[PDB]
């Protein structure tokens, strides 16, 4: 009876607590017997096979956890005679020079033609001149050991339930895919009311407008109204939206993406400065490598806009596609892993521009032998060269390597190489493969080519990037839930959600209903995104993976409806997290390792002194005048003091500091304190004097054109507070529970060679970032010696085995070894050198081997990630280890690391060696 | 620990010929490491003093004071960038010869600066600097360290000619200041042409 | 001490109060003392969103406007009765109202007449720019 067994077990534990306070072996023995009985049942190998294909297993886990808890319980200018200063502490207001202020009056009250009086002084003042535990440790601990041992086969099976990611990718490429329809990939969370965006419906009209309508109706052109501008490198999550007025609006998404859990709150999209384009905007394309760049295309025009951090247009570049007679710009494509390479695709040609070199002349100029261009995608071969793939209107897929031979230096280049694909659905008729071609897309992350035809035939294929041959072909069949729609809709607008491998988006060419596809190594999960009501025809969709308030990289899909409403869908983590599982993700512990102020400033002019508490009594000019006039001052009877608002009207200057003069009229009417940038400064003055306040680099950025100065109340019984002057200065699972319980129990019992060997096996055995943490806790002078010996001996064994079988050490395994060694190189470098003893050389050799396999570009990198997750951190760690050895070939290794063309390698090495010297 | 850091610096300078066309920017970290090691080659200890003198001799062999390729010195080159790195290292070395918060460190720092200046003068480096300066002046007529890292965050030599000019404005100036502080070493002689 | 004679606070009812008199430019004959104003006192006729004109006693004038020679109790800081902005002079106020509030026909009390001694304090005008051009320019 698994149901109820854990609640009864918790009542048993509470009664044990009773006897624990006062009693003799209250529940300790019975609980040992319960562990024995749970082992007896599981030992049923028939039940083990059933689990491989559960209540008793949960009972065992609970008993083990309880047992673990039980075991746990068991010179001066005078030298020469300038910027002079008053020392209030020494009552010199007489003055001191800059040096004397910092030397003879160091830590004194100091306020910014003269002769230092400090030095003038000949006094020499100027220096600038129980039974339960016994039973648990009697035979219970061995009992647990033998239990885990005979259950180890089943335990290894449950553990199974970079290398894995490679295997999964391999399966993805080789194993047949089942197509399943689901409604659980994306779940609706938030939606805006009708009209949130005014004028999003582009009412095309007039000669050019009629042409556009005809082209959209003929499915030759499609409008892309929304684009997300959030590069992985950048942090400016933003949304660009085009409007019927041909105006581009940039919105801030950070507020919207955080209100994901908001039960009943209006969608919030902060508007930024817009973007000016003198044409009807048909497509928006952001640069994934640089989130500031936006390509804006009309029918014949292509503009590249650069946005500042505030969302305003900083730069505007206009391209010249030189379209043929009757030709038009279909779209603009930023070449993968590039910031300047921009391809312009037309029905007649494809021109590729390097915008860093030349915006007028294309670097590449491609033409087809016949037919028209319906889609163009770019792939990077194992060599690293871009290979253009072109879908023709006739249904042929053309491929061409981008090299000097195919360059536009000699004029237009005719692409003749056709990717050969043979399928029963692919029967070319009247020179039209399955009715002709529609769309082509290559996923670098999945290393798969997606393409679709006019007759609703869509395929995913694995291609050899060297030979450009199709290796495996997988059909994507969409079954319309609505009856009578036997004909399959054609697919278009293929895209992958950035930083969410396997989640692919596309749209039916005719219907225009977005589809979300989760690609797994044996299955295509497909969800059709419907509208409630359908009246809100979906105009465009954008998917983005963002950091949630819980730091969860949630994948949000934003839909723009024709009526101007926004609808937001969220990815269901259970159905969309296959490639994001820590088992497939390259989880790495290395990640955890990873007074003269006013002399150089100038008093600002035209600064607006407009404190609201003073605005009611004095006019703006008066305030300025009084604060900048002697004998004149500003007063305020408001209890608690008042706020002065300072506005910098000079956009070329930054406020870096402020000086305030107080006490000239009456000391009792001087403010007691001031608050600026959240800092409270006490004003302890006995005579009229100035107070200096510099602004920190960060505060200088905060006080660029606006500054709020809070003035505290004076000690005047009448409540009068006075300021004499203000000067501004500036410059220009069940398995999880089971393993947790067992390993906690083992660690408590241990609190040794065989125990270490058991943990070592558990370490080698697979884990989804769980058993590892458990084995970590299991492991947590004689002690340090044993511990260090065991870890280093294993590290040496792992490095030797990898060297002998000629196999590159697993990046994660390698990084674990490096961290372990590093920790010891710090705790006991002597132990590090003695136990390991060749070791340093092996580490460094493997580092270079893994570094050489490191992916050239993250976007191009596939689901499996070779190389090292954190080279910098790794380099830092290696330097600590090498240094630890030297304290108790290495120099050559240091020189090699410093020279590495890869900058971070040497720069981090630089930092590591500074720390070792420090 | 001090002795092992010293032998590490020795092996570094021994493989140092390899650093030539590697690129000064890629080698910023290496010369900065050399500095960190030197920040300990102080005291009145003469073993450390001779290690520092051997470093200075390596830097002089690198420096082209003897070479009369003043034109090639004007033309930005790997060698020119390496010479600029050597000058920046020498400046960092002589720039910490102050007496502020120095527990007998002033005595060591002073000795280091004096030795550096003497070695530089013994190689007629001042004459070579005058030559490169006349060359850059002719270039102007034709036209008619970590501090740099902070100032120039891009970490690109940028205007090497300006850096080369600025670096000589510094190295010989430091030489003259040191030859005045240490009377034992004579200050460089400048004639009307200088 | 100079007091706001004939001026009772409409919130706390303390008549002839001292300190800064606060007069509502929307509510007819509505006045607040400094304490009630700072506390954000509201009534059925008055809300905190109503622009208010600060009026000083002579004594306060000499204190607040101390160190600079001015006319006896000469109001020089005016509040826009439409938007509530402050620190306006008879001229800058006119410019502001003409520029930003030219099309507004809401009845308001003239802050200049109210603040200036001898001027009709409860003067009500739908077009404030009219006073700014014919009576208070
Ligand atoms: Zn002085
Ligand atoms: Zn003092
Ligand atoms: Zn002094
Ligand atoms: Zn009152
Ligand atoms: Zn009111
Ligand atoms: Zn107004
Ligand atoms: Zn009036």
PDB file of C-alpha atoms in Angstrom, chain A residues 176-373:
ATOM      1  CA  UNK A 176      12.758   8.030 -38.085  1.00  0.00           C
ATOM      2  CA  UNK A 177      10.625  10.863 -36.814  1.00  0.00           C
ATOM      3  CA  UNK A 178       6.997  10.501 -35.632  1.00  0.00           C
ATOM      4  CA  UNK A 179       4.796  13.556 -36.399  1.00  0.00           C
ATOM      5  CA  UNK A 180       2.402  14.311 -33.516  1.00  0.00           C
ATOM      6  CA  UNK A 181      -0.156  17.068 -33.204  1.00  0.00           C
ATOM      7  CA  UNK A 182      -0.324  18.749 -29.724  1.00  0.00           C
ATOM      8  CA  UNK A 183      -1.869  21.826 -28.086  1.00  0.00           C
ATOM      9  CA  UNK A 184       0.593  21.872 -25.181  1.00  0.00           C
ATOM     10  CA  UNK A 185       3.724  23.383 -26.694  1.00  0.00           C
ATOM     11  CA  UNK A 186       2.692  27.037 -26.220  1.00  0.00           C
ATOM     12  CA  UNK A 187       0.207  28.101 -23.544  1.00  0.00           C
ATOM     13  CA  UNK A 188      -1.691  31.422 -23.745  1.00  0.00           C
ATOM     14  CA  UNK A 189      -0.775  33.671 -20.784  1.00  0.00           C
ATOM     15  CA  UNK A 190      -1.490  37.395 -21.574  1.00  0.00           C
ATOM     16  CA  UNK A 191      -3.327  39.441 -24.217  1.00  0.00           C
ATOM     17  CA  UNK A 192      -3.901  43.062 -24.933  1.00  0.00           C
ATOM     18  CA  UNK A 193      -7.273  44.684 -25.872  1.00  0.00           C
ATOM     19  CA  UNK A 194      -8.130  45.478 -29.488  1.00  0.00           C
ATOM     20  CA  UNK A 195      -6.127  48.541 -30.747  1.00  0.00           C
ATOM     21  CA  UNK A 196      -3.087  48.380 -28.469  1.00  0.00           C
ATOM     22  CA  UNK A 197      -1.192  49.246 -31.660  1.00  0.00           C
ATOM     23  CA  UNK A 198      -2.903  51.722 -33.879  1.00  0.00           C
ATOM     24  CA  UNK A 199      -2.375  51.493 -37.623  1.00  0.00           C
ATOM     25  CA  UNK A 200      -0.654  48.143 -37.789  1.00  0.00           C
ATOM     26  CA  UNK A 201      -2.983  46.999 -40.583  1.00  0.00           C
ATOM     27  CA  UNK A 202      -1.169  48.261 -43.734  1.00  0.00           C
ATOM     28  CA  UNK A 203      -3.953  49.363 -46.164  1.00  0.00           C
ATOM     29  CA  UNK A 204      -1.964  49.086 -49.448  1.00  0.00           C
ATOM     30  CA  UNK A 205      -3.433  51.351 -52.179  1.00  0.00           C
ATOM     31  CA  UNK A 206      -2.266  53.156 -55.363  1.00  0.00           C
ATOM     32  CA  UNK A 207       0.026  51.925 -58.188  1.00  0.00           C
ATOM     33  CA  UNK A 208       2.708  50.683 -55.769  1.00  0.00           C
ATOM     34  CA  UNK A 209       0.165  49.597 -53.157  1.00  0.00           C
ATOM     35  CA  UNK A 210      -1.780  47.540 -55.807  1.00  0.00           C
ATOM     36  CA  UNK A 211       1.435  45.870 -56.829  1.00  0.00           C
ATOM     37  CA  UNK A 212       2.172  44.978 -53.231  1.00  0.00           C
ATOM     38  CA  UNK A 213      -1.368  43.544 -52.764  1.00  0.00           C
ATOM     39  CA  UNK A 214      -1.016  41.425 -55.884  1.00  0.00           C
ATOM     40  CA  UNK A 215       2.329  40.071 -54.767  1.00  0.00           C
ATOM     41  CA  UNK A 216       1.070  39.228 -51.234  1.00  0.00           C
ATOM     42  CA  UNK A 217      -2.081  37.566 -52.705  1.00  0.00           C
ATOM     43  CA  UNK A 218       0.162  35.560 -55.096  1.00  0.00           C
ATOM     44  CA  UNK A 219       2.229  34.377 -52.015  1.00  0.00           C
ATOM     45  CA  UNK A 220       5.318  35.794 -53.587  1.00  0.00           C
ATOM     46  CA  UNK A 221       5.766  38.369 -50.761  1.00  0.00           C
ATOM     47  CA  UNK A 222       4.861  38.274 -47.180  1.00  0.00           C
ATOM     48  CA  UNK A 223       4.898  41.115 -44.738  1.00  0.00           C
ATOM     49  CA  UNK A 224       7.096  40.904 -41.537  1.00  0.00           C
ATOM     50  CA  UNK A 225       5.802  43.669 -39.255  1.00  0.00           C
ATOM     51  CA  UNK A 226       7.606  42.670 -36.024  1.00  0.00           C
ATOM     52  CA  UNK A 227      11.178  41.944 -35.103  1.00  0.00           C
ATOM     53  CA  UNK A 228      12.952  41.368 -31.828  1.00  0.00           C
ATOM     54  CA  UNK A 229      16.288  43.198 -31.327  1.00  0.00           C
ATOM     55  CA  UNK A 230      17.855  41.150 -28.461  1.00  0.00           C
ATOM     56  CA  UNK A 231      21.292  39.658 -29.365  1.00  0.00           C
ATOM     57  CA  UNK A 232      22.543  37.006 -26.862  1.00  0.00           C
ATOM     58  CA  UNK A 233      25.642  39.200 -26.331  1.00  0.00           C
ATOM     59  CA  UNK A 234      23.470  42.321 -25.802  1.00  0.00           C
ATOM     60  CA  UNK A 235      20.904  42.845 -22.998  1.00  0.00           C
ATOM     61  CA  UNK A 236      18.613  45.466 -24.667  1.00  0.00           C
ATOM     62  CA  UNK A 237      15.533  43.188 -25.105  1.00  0.00           C
ATOM     63  CA  UNK A 238      13.456  45.292 -27.570  1.00  0.00           C
ATOM     64  CA  UNK A 239      10.584  44.977 -30.060  1.00  0.00           C
ATOM     65  CA  UNK A 240      10.438  46.828 -33.343  1.00  0.00           C
ATOM     66  CA  UNK A 241       7.031  47.260 -34.961  1.00  0.00           C
ATOM     67  CA  UNK A 242       6.287  48.781 -38.406  1.00  0.00           C
ATOM     68  CA  UNK A 243       3.009  50.727 -38.963  1.00  0.00           C
ATOM     69  CA  UNK A 244       0.715  51.714 -41.889  1.00  0.00           C
ATOM     70  CA  UNK A 245       2.237  55.251 -41.644  1.00  0.00           C
ATOM     71  CA  UNK A 246       5.601  53.620 -42.559  1.00  0.00           C
ATOM     72  CA  UNK A 247       6.963  54.548 -39.096  1.00  0.00           C
ATOM     73  CA  UNK A 248       9.032  52.084 -37.027  1.00  0.00           C
ATOM     74  CA  UNK A 249       8.336  51.993 -33.334  1.00  0.00           C
ATOM     75  CA  UNK A 250      10.776  50.473 -30.877  1.00  0.00           C
ATOM     76  CA  UNK A 251       9.277  49.099 -27.699  1.00  0.00           C
ATOM     77  CA  UNK A 252      10.783  47.977 -24.479  1.00  0.00           C
ATOM     78  CA  UNK A 253       9.957  44.253 -23.809  1.00  0.00           C
ATOM     79  CA  UNK A 254      11.542  43.879 -20.372  1.00  0.00           C
ATOM     80  CA  UNK A 255       8.362  45.100 -18.580  1.00  0.00           C
ATOM     81  CA  UNK A 256       6.086  42.935 -20.643  1.00  0.00           C
ATOM     82  CA  UNK A 257       8.164  39.771 -20.280  1.00  0.00           C
ATOM     83  CA  UNK A 258       8.324  40.210 -16.467  1.00  0.00           C
ATOM     84  CA  UNK A 259       4.538  40.659 -16.032  1.00  0.00           C
ATOM     85  CA  UNK A 260       4.228  37.075 -17.391  1.00  0.00           C
ATOM     86  CA  UNK A 261       2.558  35.952 -14.110  1.00  0.00           C
ATOM     87  CA  UNK A 262       0.416  39.138 -13.812  1.00  0.00           C
ATOM     88  CA  UNK A 263      -3.144  37.802 -13.211  1.00  0.00           C
ATOM     89  CA  UNK A 264      -5.090  40.909 -14.394  1.00  0.00           C
ATOM     90  CA  UNK A 265      -2.591  43.637 -15.471  1.00  0.00           C
ATOM     91  CA  UNK A 266      -2.562  45.530 -18.828  1.00  0.00           C
ATOM     92  CA  UNK A 267       0.287  44.539 -21.222  1.00  0.00           C
ATOM     93  CA  UNK A 268       3.100  47.125 -20.775  1.00  0.00           C
ATOM     94  CA  UNK A 269       5.344  48.014 -23.776  1.00  0.00           C
ATOM     95  CA  UNK A 270       7.398  51.201 -23.097  1.00  0.00           C
ATOM     96  CA  UNK A 271       7.693  53.128 -26.414  1.00  0.00           C
ATOM     97  CA  UNK A 272      11.195  54.389 -27.381  1.00  0.00           C
ATOM     98  CA  UNK A 273      12.205  56.953 -30.066  1.00  0.00           C
ATOM     99  CA  UNK A 274      10.757  55.784 -33.436  1.00  0.00           C
ATOM    100  CA  UNK A 275      12.662  55.014 -36.692  1.00  0.00           C
ATOM    101  CA  UNK A 276      12.205  57.084 -39.925  1.00  0.00           C
ATOM    102  CA  UNK A 277      11.872  55.225 -43.289  1.00  0.00           C
ATOM    103  CA  UNK A 278      10.670  57.051 -46.476  1.00  0.00           C
ATOM    104  CA  UNK A 279       8.801  54.006 -47.923  1.00  0.00           C
ATOM    105  CA  UNK A 280       6.154  51.373 -47.138  1.00  0.00           C
ATOM    106  CA  UNK A 281       7.903  48.938 -44.810  1.00  0.00           C
ATOM    107  CA  UNK A 282       7.383  45.295 -45.915  1.00  0.00           C
ATOM    108  CA  UNK A 283      10.049  43.470 -43.805  1.00  0.00           C
ATOM    109  CA  UNK A 284      12.065  43.987 -40.656  1.00  0.00           C
ATOM    110  CA  UNK A 285      15.159  41.956 -39.927  1.00  0.00           C
ATOM    111  CA  UNK A 286      17.367  42.317 -36.827  1.00  0.00           C
ATOM    112  CA  UNK A 287      20.997  41.342 -36.659  1.00  0.00           C
ATOM    113  CA  UNK A 288      21.353  38.434 -34.269  1.00  0.00           C
ATOM    114  CA  UNK A 289      25.099  39.257 -33.660  1.00  0.00           C
ATOM    115  CA  UNK A 290      24.383  42.882 -32.938  1.00  0.00           C
ATOM    116  CA  UNK A 291      21.027  43.863 -31.421  1.00  0.00           C
ATOM    117  CA  UNK A 292      21.436  47.570 -32.535  1.00  0.00           C
ATOM    118  CA  UNK A 293      21.245  46.878 -36.241  1.00  0.00           C
ATOM    119  CA  UNK A 294      17.892  46.644 -38.010  1.00  0.00           C
ATOM    120  CA  UNK A 295      17.432  46.057 -41.738  1.00  0.00           C
ATOM    121  CA  UNK A 296      14.270  47.696 -43.084  1.00  0.00           C
ATOM    122  CA  UNK A 297      13.021  46.725 -46.491  1.00  0.00           C
ATOM    123  CA  UNK A 298      10.355  48.134 -48.803  1.00  0.00           C
ATOM    124  CA  UNK A 299       9.505  46.958 -52.321  1.00  0.00           C
ATOM    125  CA  UNK A 300      12.633  48.498 -53.885  1.00  0.00           C
ATOM    126  CA  UNK A 301      14.327  49.953 -50.827  1.00  0.00           C
ATOM    127  CA  UNK A 302      16.562  48.528 -48.137  1.00  0.00           C
ATOM    128  CA  UNK A 303      17.632  50.626 -45.211  1.00  0.00           C
ATOM    129  CA  UNK A 304      19.902  49.598 -42.268  1.00  0.00           C
ATOM    130  CA  UNK A 305      19.110  51.520 -39.056  1.00  0.00           C
ATOM    131  CA  UNK A 306      21.338  51.656 -35.985  1.00  0.00           C
ATOM    132  CA  UNK A 307      19.636  52.188 -32.657  1.00  0.00           C
ATOM    133  CA  UNK A 308      21.092  53.769 -29.563  1.00  0.00           C
ATOM    134  CA  UNK A 309      20.526  52.421 -26.050  1.00  0.00           C
ATOM    135  CA  UNK A 310      17.510  54.766 -25.684  1.00  0.00           C
ATOM    136  CA  UNK A 311      15.934  53.199 -28.822  1.00  0.00           C
ATOM    137  CA  UNK A 312      16.656  56.313 -31.037  1.00  0.00           C
ATOM    138  CA  UNK A 313      18.153  56.031 -34.505  1.00  0.00           C
ATOM    139  CA  UNK A 314      21.929  56.745 -34.246  1.00  0.00           C
ATOM    140  CA  UNK A 315      22.855  55.883 -37.799  1.00  0.00           C
ATOM    141  CA  UNK A 316      21.131  55.322 -41.099  1.00  0.00           C
ATOM    142  CA  UNK A 317      22.653  53.320 -44.028  1.00  0.00           C
ATOM    143  CA  UNK A 318      20.878  53.085 -47.430  1.00  0.00           C
ATOM    144  CA  UNK A 319      21.637  50.118 -49.731  1.00  0.00           C
ATOM    145  CA  UNK A 320      21.315  49.982 -53.564  1.00  0.00           C
ATOM    146  CA  UNK A 321      20.133  46.507 -54.710  1.00  0.00           C
ATOM    147  CA  UNK A 322      20.022  47.754 -58.341  1.00  0.00           C
ATOM    148  CA  UNK A 323      16.898  45.600 -59.025  1.00  0.00           C
ATOM    149  CA  UNK A 324      16.264  44.500 -62.655  1.00  0.00           C
ATOM    150  CA  UNK A 325      13.276  45.847 -64.644  1.00  0.00           C
ATOM    151  CA  UNK A 326      10.161  44.784 -62.691  1.00  0.00           C
ATOM    152  CA  UNK A 327      12.350  43.219 -59.942  1.00  0.00           C
ATOM    153  CA  UNK A 328      11.685  43.921 -56.211  1.00  0.00           C
ATOM    154  CA  UNK A 329      13.420  43.246 -52.841  1.00  0.00           C
ATOM    155  CA  UNK A 330      11.821  40.048 -51.393  1.00  0.00           C
ATOM    156  CA  UNK A 331      13.769  40.248 -48.071  1.00  0.00           C
ATOM    157  CA  UNK A 332      17.126  41.042 -46.356  1.00  0.00           C
ATOM    158  CA  UNK A 333      19.195  38.295 -44.628  1.00  0.00           C
ATOM    159  CA  UNK A 334      22.051  38.936 -42.137  1.00  0.00           C
ATOM    160  CA  UNK A 335      24.577  36.159 -42.950  1.00  0.00           C
ATOM    161  CA  UNK A 336      24.835  33.818 -39.895  1.00  0.00           C
ATOM    162  CA  UNK A 337      27.667  34.734 -37.495  1.00  0.00           C
ATOM    163  CA  UNK A 338      28.174  38.137 -39.203  1.00  0.00           C
ATOM    164  CA  UNK A 339      27.394  41.822 -38.389  1.00  0.00           C
ATOM    165  CA  UNK A 340      28.078  43.482 -41.793  1.00  0.00           C
ATOM    166  CA  UNK A 341      27.236  40.715 -44.302  1.00  0.00           C
ATOM    167  CA  UNK A 342      23.665  41.481 -45.522  1.00  0.00           C
ATOM    168  CA  UNK A 343      22.011  39.541 -48.370  1.00  0.00           C
ATOM    169  CA  UNK A 344      19.319  41.097 -50.529  1.00  0.00           C
ATOM    170  CA  UNK A 345      17.072  38.506 -52.102  1.00  0.00           C
ATOM    171  CA  UNK A 346      15.024  39.233 -55.203  1.00  0.00           C
ATOM    172  CA  UNK A 347      13.136  37.070 -57.635  1.00  0.00           C
ATOM    173  CA  UNK A 348      16.030  37.438 -60.102  1.00  0.00           C
ATOM    174  CA  UNK A 349      19.131  37.608 -58.043  1.00  0.00           C
ATOM    175  CA  UNK A 350      20.809  37.458 -54.662  1.00  0.00           C
ATOM    176  CA  UNK A 351      23.271  40.210 -53.770  1.00  0.00           C
ATOM    177  CA  UNK A 352      25.449  39.995 -50.661  1.00  0.00           C
ATOM    178  CA  UNK A 353      26.929  43.209 -49.230  1.00  0.00           C
ATOM    179  CA  UNK A 354      29.701  43.637 -46.741  1.00  0.00           C
ATOM    180  CA  UNK A 355      28.578  46.858 -45.130  1.00  0.00           C
ATOM    181  CA  UNK A 356      31.937  47.339 -43.438  1.00  0.00           C
ATOM    182  CA  UNK A 357      33.601  47.575 -46.802  1.00  0.00           C
ATOM    183  CA  UNK A 358      31.039  48.883 -49.314  1.00  0.00           C
ATOM    184  CA  UNK A 359      27.287  49.528 -49.277  1.00  0.00           C
ATOM    185  CA  UNK A 360      27.145  50.137 -53.084  1.00  0.00           C
ATOM    186  CA  UNK A 361      28.955  47.132 -54.565  1.00  0.00           C
ATOM    187  CA  UNK A 362      27.959  43.616 -53.624  1.00  0.00           C
ATOM    188  CA  UNK A 363      30.615  41.154 -52.588  1.00  0.00           C
ATOM    189  CA  UNK A 364      28.578  38.357 -54.154  1.00  0.00           C
ATOM    190  CA  UNK A 365      26.123  38.551 -57.079  1.00  0.00           C
ATOM    191  CA  UNK A 366      24.193  35.210 -57.696  1.00  0.00           C
ATOM    192  CA  UNK A 367      21.785  34.314 -60.509  1.00  0.00           C
ATOM    193  CA  UNK A 368      19.815  31.104 -61.293  1.00  0.00           C
ATOM    194  CA  UNK A 369      19.853  29.364 -64.734  1.00  0.00           C
ATOM    195  CA  UNK A 370      16.022  29.558 -64.911  1.00  0.00           C
ATOM    196  CA  UNK A 371      12.800  29.951 -62.809  1.00  0.00           C
ATOM    197  CA  UNK A 372      12.603  32.517 -59.937  1.00  0.00           C
ATOM    198  CA  UNK A 373      13.988  32.684 -56.338  1.00  0.00           C
TER     199      UNK A 373
END
